[PDB]
């Protein structure tokens, strides 16, 4: 504590930084000899100084973003001559939405694809990876196939630009889609015809295209191409999968936090849990992410099948008796929701 | 089919307020009152009505055992913030066909009873409220 | 956990008015009534409300033993100066979980009973009031 | 200190009206009702009041034995002149701490009962009034 | 910080008219009104004002108990002279901070009421005026 | 989406006048008015407009607890200067999204109230004005 | 044949202003007024008319939950530009025959409200305007 | 600002006197007699005046 300080400073006008975002966490894997281990980047100015300039430019590409910059960026650095599975094993603990590795060989790409699919299908954690040239048939991975992009007289390979693609996806609000979003920094791309681009989109690739006097994303589809009776076409859109994953994460969070191993498995507690889930869905409806008139309800058929499997005598039992029958430590539920999609095709017929 | 045993008795009623079970509840009540407008149509002698909406009204009565409502709403009511609650009512009579379990949402109370006692009289608290939404579970 | 013994009885109530214990008190009551305004929102069938404030109301009943209210307020009310008081109410039943002790502040009385007697009837006095504040002590 | 013997009984009440003692008095009552105005202050949720004045109200009931009220006010009420009276009320219970003796001044009656009888019923007269001033003698 | 008790009640006002106290006063008003001229400048959107002059207006209301106004005016208006008066108003609420005393000078009344009565109605007088200057004697 | 809780209540308003907080404020208004000129073209049926200028108007209402306005104006109008004032209004409801703070500048008042009282009525002051410019400090 | 259920209720209206949905709307008006000239002929008793032109008038009313109008107008009026707006109103009662959707174009607002609050009152905004043309999108 | 009974100090004093704290309700401890001693606690908040001002101007 010194004398009272009254200082008026004069300085030049400074450029205004792009606005931050509330959602979107990207995990980046890098190879450099120093500053190993996990690193955090909220602002583009705060980068480790000892890192190489090429890695710094990768991080800058990631932080480029969209209408909002991504919420935060997790950078994991390894020396080199180190297996990617060690980084994956460390990254299982953390939470993230999109993961990218600029310097992946085909073995690393295969390992990352297998890790992502195992996490989504077995570990029950909804995460995504942006990869260069992978023919994976899963909604988790996004296949970005566009080579030799020019960014200010510098050439970036197909694996190198996945950082910019992941940053662009993370910076998009939930209402919007990345279809036809233009890249001002890109100056040129290799020539491609309409038929080839259409076939590539039909095969499940996300590409760059020249249209309406700019370069923009052709379509926002993921790599899923084989459709089953229950999967459907709606699962091929990035926006739909994103909102579904958000819903899954929130519901699993509340369920784990408040009910697993916490209360006895009675019918009243099942009703309370139903009420909590319904209230969350109502909040989501108010936020305009999903359509109104969603329902949550005890699953009667699954409970009946489980009771039959357990060998109890289901005959001479009333519907209320089956509904409120004890079921050990299991809970059966079902719900119904509805989600919309953005405008992407328009037909205008004019009579002259 | 209609027997006097099937008439539901209020002794088999249970209430959950803000996720906690109340055991001193004495009575629970919730109703929707529709708003109607009279409309006279030329050539018709009988007057008809048009439906506008509803207002949810109800009340709770419970024995004075603990200061449940003070902790629920007092300090917030002073500070200028009005909380909203969810109530679950259950009615399961053993001699009835089934149970009835309704959830009442967006509940706003009408007052907060600080003190009410008279010599030689046991304690009771009445709490009216209003609501907007509801959901059906286990209908008959 | 709920037993019939745990209901608080009014016979175990005490009152301090202006710092002096009143032993002839019969009943005490204090009340805050919320002010609410109806608001109709487009696209919604149920009518909601907005909370605007509250009014504090209460009353005291006591046996006619001495001239307490006279000495408290008479001359000052005639002169044109209105006093304000503080009341403390305690409820402590040995069979209950615990005690309840609330202090009510900024009390302004509503009337002054000078004389009220009838042959063959014992004397009683009822005194309503208004208040704007309170504090919690010994909340169960 | 508080005993049931100390509660004043209304049988030990006496009234003087216009300087003469009434012996058929059945009940006497006089009260002051304050006038309050609600005032809302910015930033405060509790509504306060402002005290503006009072109105004095009372009544007398007595057995119908003599035409006391007719002689008091009838002819003057026709002629256009309204008289005013002074009443003294005393309450002295032998088992109480002391007596209570109040004088009510500037009394104006509300009506004059000419005839009221029903076969098989004893006679009674009720007379409400209003006043403005009062004085304290022998407080407790 | 403001209290409800600090609002001045009009029952505590007093009026002196030409040096004589007026006990039958009902209300008193006195206000100065400023005259403005709009200023508009070509090429600018906004409009501004400047003051030009001021004027004084007010009125009095009395209970009708005597012919005070006729004696005050007399034949002065009829004979062609120009009578002027001085009025002093005081407002002294015991619960407020202090008193407020103003002198209103150079009063010219607007009319004179000779008779205004109706069967079943109590009489009142209203007297508007204009004035030119004022002085403050007590500031609250 | 809209909630009924998000509507701003006027009890949560505050006012600063010439740098001093006004605790007895009752309401505050401020509004900009736009002047239009009608455009009519021969051969066309429609009518259009163009903006000409704008002006500002508003008013303040207070409880009468002191002589704030007379001190504020004083003798400035009488001597012939041109007093101008700055007012700041704030509206911060705890249940709304945020606050709203506006500065109203270059204020000229319309009149001055010296005395306005009546028996049995609580006092109030009303003060209209005009202004030229405004600034937004806090937006919502 | 008409039914009472076919009368449209105003709770089912919706408004878009400059492409953004307004969830706090309270009422909406829009009307076209025709101008007439009286024709009088010498030798004939009757009077006839011919149309001259038309003009558009309307208004909007909102609950006060944010500063929407100030952000919409901004400095456009102050900077001397001439802002115009487009409004779309929909009325879709489930019990009626169908929906009714109108687009109101070339809207010029009449004033801007900066602050209008009072203690104990919930806030509302009123915004009149004029327009020049309209389109029908859904006809019932 | 708040005022209330200092519970921890009362408990420490009662323990110092050697009374048994087991099988005792919280209200019993709170209302227990402490000879002639009284334990209280409170909370307030005091503001400071403007003394340092930092203004940054972009030209």
Numbering used by the authors:
A (entry chain D): 3 to 354
B (entry chain a), C (entry chain 7), D (entry chain 9), E (entry chain 5), F (entry chain I), G (entry chain P): 3 to 142
H (entry chain 1): 296 to 354
What does the paper say about this structure?
Here, we report the atomic structures of an engineered diffocin, a contractile syringe-like molecular machine that kills the Gram-positive bacterium Clostridioides difficile. Captured in one pre-contraction and two post-contraction states, each structure fashions six proteins in the bacteria-targeting baseplate, two proteins in the energy-storing trunk, and a collar linking the sheath with the membrane-penetrating tube. Specific attachment of baseplate tail fibers to receptors on the surface of a target bacterial cell triggers conformational changes of the neighboring baseplate, which leads to reorientation of sheath proteins and contraction of the entire sheath assembly. Since the sheath and the tube are anchored together at the opposite end by the collar, collapsing the sheath pushes the tube through the baseplate, driving it to puncture the cell wall and underlying cytoplasmic membrane.
The diffocin baseplate has an inner section that connects to the tube and an outer section that connects to the sheath. The outer section of the baseplate consists of sheath initiator (CD1370) and triplex proteins (CD1371 and CD1372). Two conformers of CD1371, Tri2A and Tri2B, and one of CD1372, Tri1, form the triplex, and six copies of the triplex form the baseplate wedge, surrounding the inner baseplate. Within each triplex, the N-terminal regions of the three subunits form a core bundle and a trifurcation unit, from which the C-terminal dimerization domains of Tri2A and Tri2B extend in opposite directions to interact with neighboring triplexes. The C-terminal region of Tri1, along with the tail fiber linked to it, was not resolved in the cryoEM maps. Notably, both Tri2A and Tri2B include a wing domain inserted between the core bundle and the trifurcation unit, reminiscent of gp6 in phage T412. These wing domains contribute to the interface with the hydrolase domain of the hub-hydrolase. The hydrolase domain has a dumbbell shape, with its two lobes binding to the peripheral region of the baseplate wedge. Given that the local resolution of the peripheral region of the baseplate is only sufficient to assign secondary structural elements, the model of the hydrolase domain and surrounding triplex motifs were built with the assistance of AlphaFold225. The N-terminal domain (residues 49–105) of the sheath initiator binds to the core bundle of the triplex, while the C-terminal β-hairpin (residues 106–135) interacts with two sheath proteins on the first sheath layer by forming a conserved handshake interface.
